[PDB]
Symmetry: D2
């Protein structure tokens, strides 16, 4: 039940299709950072998860280049999907920027997002 629209706490929006194979493909609209419009997203998910109640592991990447801006950065979300009345995708994320060698050490931001099927 991953296919559809999801909203994080910060008002960001993404749409995705979860293929029967394990493909995640869709769009991400970010409500923060140097971003404007929709950005392509692609990732993977466990298409045959544990049947003991455990969530479904997944992950996806968005490169912050589109027709509007190019932040020269990229975020990957790593987390799991959990079904039910209060369905949510809980993730941790890493945002790496292209940096010179001198600045590499501070190239990566880390955060956490919680996505739900309704807006905050």
């Amino acid at each position: 039940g991953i296919t559809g629209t999801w909203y994080n706490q910060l008002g960001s929006t993404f749409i995705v299709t979860a293929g029967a194979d394990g493909a995640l493909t869709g769009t991400y609209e970010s409500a923060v950072g140097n971003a404007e419009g929709d950005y392509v997203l692609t990732g993977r998910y466990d298409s045959a998860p544990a049947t003991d109640g455990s969530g479904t592991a997944l992950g996806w990447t968005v490169a912050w280049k589109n027709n509007y801006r190019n932040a020269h950065s990229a975020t990957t979300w790593s987390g799991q999907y959990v079904g039910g009345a209060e369905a949510r995708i809980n993730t941790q994320w890493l945002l790496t920027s292209g940096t010179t060698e001198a600045n590499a050490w501070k190239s990566t931001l880390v955060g956490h997002d919680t996505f739900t099927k309704v807006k905050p």
Copy 2:
């Protein structure tokens, strides 16, 4: 630059194809963890990187399910490709396992990987 076979510090291999559109595709074989054989890889990279000597932002995911195993988990690498005599893909990763709600707190491991174009 990015397209080709890559090797990390631990014995893992990473064969990737960089699309003109910013797409990352390929297969991954992990030397560690609950894995064996090839796994699908999907990601994105900045197809118009800055020209100031900055690295090239990218990310990809691998879900650890293939025809032989399912670890009920996914790893995302977030990083930057760096050129030179010694080109590298410089990454940090998160590995999230599908868990129950009462084990969600210890769901995600974090680490780093350096990919070089020659075997360790």
Copy 3:
């Protein structure tokens, strides 16, 4: 502001004393993991925070050894204290277990914690 008893989202408690010098001292009791009883806590915080409405940078460590248990691991929380009607300590943490070299790759878990001044 920071000195006092704090509670996270999972049932853990965090009693801390903020020194004038920037020192953080106290005891922690974890509701999760390989833990029971009180554990020593030591850390630091910015004793001269900016006045522009910014949070107050801080961090502390707890090694999971006390007179009753030893989990051969340590957790560091990195975060910022935020004032208001609803003061919070906003954190991300890394939990590193002592491992063998061939398990060093899966040594560290990453997560986040929100500490409030009232019980969950």
Copy 4:
């Protein structure tokens, strides 16, 4: 064998004493960021680690305020010590800054450092 001077790959220097109890106390000189001089560091370590070859879990915090600058930030290192000819402390780190609420999402940098008993 933690007590003494350690150098990371980036030329940073720290000195520490590991008390028989589990106390880490000392100084950190950073070779990167908005830092000048020595900064106080405090943390914890496992003072009775596993006797199977496993490393010794530890963690420490530095608040980036001293007599020279105040970056209004703080780093926590989480990792393990490993003895032997090639002794090293391998860590992951989190650098949180005080931010307004609007900017909290990007308040934390993440990296990895490897410390040795001799300079790079």
